[PDB]
């Protein structure tokens, strides 16, 4: 019907499932055990559970997940979390050798002997689906192993499938923190692999994520139960869409026909606006006008992009919760009429608005307060161009002196991408200024 | 099944509820079938021996 | 208290005691837990002279577990969802030293 | 009426014979004391039960089985064990000495002065018999006794009776796995003594079943507590037709005139879908979509042939439960129009389906699950010449040696039979791989 396939792969994308399927949970009210209270809403697995969750014959809303794993302690762990019954046994695909932040051996010497057992998961998900609008894949770049695994059951459903959406999240890379070497050089590999076969690849920044933390959150000293809770409510409100009803409507395969512009460039930023806590929404309020201003003040973007130092071609806004149409267009016009703005020409219509009624939803004891208004905001501009400057004159210098290649050679492995990567990437970056100059 | 049919546009596939079965459900050597044993009726009752 | 103590007023330019230790939470309940904790350890060393596991629940645990609890291989033919389960009661009978 | 005699020939098919009539005993009620309390289920001694006992002037059900072994351990174990007040007295045939897994040892030193005895014992059962739909025979190929004396009563009861019906299940030897180097060589004297008056059997595998059993039942050191069960749950699917009633039935008559094509090939392949453990069946869902895929994945099956490596010629679906002719009809047909499955143009259809409503039953202390929906796969294919090469091959180096013919020159053989067995084998190799030809 309308439903999509999750699946996380990796020490990257184990904790951000775990906040988003609590969210779930809390949001539709599952009871972390599985089943409802006396309300009647079990059935033949058609209600609003039918597009997240195989709620069956037993009774128990069964998450739509496969993580694979390649170190066994985190998925043990989350084994030994509390809503181990509320999620299917052989989704959690284990092993007992990590990749090692090498790409290739990630990609080759462990990969392939897992990747029989994911397909069989994913097939016996697709037999069972009628709707199969596509798949949720969460990863890193700056991962050990969620990059080369990644790329091969990325070039799997692919070649299998091209008639699905493919959507991914990244944690991206910090621009100047680099807890991991390896990262440039598995990190480019990722993308030059992965370039071909993307349909839309999106990113965030850890970096960024704490300045807002410490800015309007007032929390100078914020967790990971917060980062992935953010990250969490933001894919919520990306996939309410699908859950709720609205008057005017869009859906995944609208965000790619309707945002990338051409062939290769598919990699925009997000935010959200209204990010504030407790008190701060108790004697402030929020409202349409402002929550436009707030989601386009240069700093708010989790990225280190300065608008003023690009130039805008696309917006998507989401809004979730009350609100009247007039407001809406009308700040979006007075936005048009402002002069620090910037907008290419090919773009006099750039605005994709989409309203759902359903206010979002809070988590116990955590940090962000009730929502009347709130705003996804996904925006496609050219700035992001200086990012991949940064790392080819990273890459440069490592590769003049042919440096941790050793590594990679030993476990069997030869200059050819090494090369073919950075022309790769140039061709982006030419790109980029070839449509961004008019 | 004309019930079912009175839901929706689509139809959806409603069944007995199963716990229902587990609770109540002859498992091992202990039954959970009740019997009773009684004599038909008729004007004049003439099989009364069955 | 005097205004609140549960609350101290938001981007407090002043300082609190108990900097260290719990921390890393938001701001508002760190206040309320931190003066606790100054009472707390105010009474303790007033004294005045007194001289004068969810890992394993109910019904055991999930397929594919490691991690060796007590036993197991030295005993088996069983289901590994019973074999979990009834090792979840004999913890508590031979190999008691768990806990 | 609908009534069948069981013979248990040796070590092994009396063991199993235990835990199966465990089993049957269970789905009717009867206790291991075999007298209910005051409740009825006794009449005519013409009920359910009557398939497999007559309860007498009484009021105890008797097996419709005999149990001839000829190492008296077992059959003292189990008359010392827990069901031997309700096993008949003198049914249950033991010997003094063994058959030490020479085939001449069983067919011409002992099985003489024994079979007297039993071909008594069977007609005094078939006396009180009145429909008499067949005999269910469990003997075993690598059988350390059984194999001669199963021989010898095999063609007698055919030559005397032949009109009624004759099944054999029995355990197949291993590709690679040995208890017996001179398995082969009784393996070869039952098959060229037996293809000629066996009506249809069917093999399984002891590690095939183990491998089921840690890949999804997860049990990570069985025995045949476990294993026996299983069988004894096919065995109890197979016969569910004849217990019950229903919408439509089957029966082994139309087993005998259906599943095999042609004279001398008679030797299907045996399968249940459904092989789950407790918390699978509890959180997850079954239905006949899936049943049946996996029922037809390839490494479900208790005989390691691979059916790229094979066509299929017949199929037979048992579905017990709670399942309906539609759905019934709708996975059939997807199932055919997918093309890994290569059907030989002998059949246009290759399925036949039989229904039952009487869920199957749980035993305590078992693995199985509280399973609505099952479904018996009984499928003929040309994947298995494979293992006749297998086993000529295996066969041919070490007699063109000679090792043991001493013992059997000094207990009577000569070798006109040794050299006739493999052209037979031949024959069949031959006539396999011309019915495959089109
Ligand atoms: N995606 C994600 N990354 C995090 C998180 N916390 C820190 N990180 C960064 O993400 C990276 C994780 O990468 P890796 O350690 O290579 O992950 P992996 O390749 O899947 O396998 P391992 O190295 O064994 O853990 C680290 O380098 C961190 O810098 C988090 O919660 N989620
Ligand atoms: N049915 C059954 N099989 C068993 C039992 N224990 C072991 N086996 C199986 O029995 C098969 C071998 O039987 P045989 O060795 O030929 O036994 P036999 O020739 O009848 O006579 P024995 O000397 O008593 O063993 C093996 O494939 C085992 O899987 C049991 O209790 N019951």
Redesign the interface.
Known sequence: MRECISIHVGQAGVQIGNACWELYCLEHGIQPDGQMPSDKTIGGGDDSFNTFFSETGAGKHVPRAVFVDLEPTVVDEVRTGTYRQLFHPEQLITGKEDAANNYARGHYTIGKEIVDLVLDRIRKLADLCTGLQGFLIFHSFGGGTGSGFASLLMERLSVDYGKKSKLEFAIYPAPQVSTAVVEPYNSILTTHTTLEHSDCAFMVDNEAIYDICRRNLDIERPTYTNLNRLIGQIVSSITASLRFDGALNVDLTEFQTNLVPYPRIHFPLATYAPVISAEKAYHEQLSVAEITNACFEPANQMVKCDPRHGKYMACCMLYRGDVVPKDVNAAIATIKTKRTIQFVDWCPTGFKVGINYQPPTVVPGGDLAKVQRAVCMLSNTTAIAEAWARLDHKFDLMYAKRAFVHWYVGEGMEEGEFSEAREDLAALEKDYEEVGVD | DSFRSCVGLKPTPHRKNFKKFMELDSFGNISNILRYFGKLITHKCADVDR | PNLIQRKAI??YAGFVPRFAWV??????DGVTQAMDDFDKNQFVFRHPVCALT??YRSQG???????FIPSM?DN???????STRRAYQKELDRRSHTL
């Open positions: 938001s981007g921390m890393g939470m938001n701001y508002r969810t890992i645990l999930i397929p594919f577990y490691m991690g291989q088996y033919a069983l289901t590994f969802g019973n």
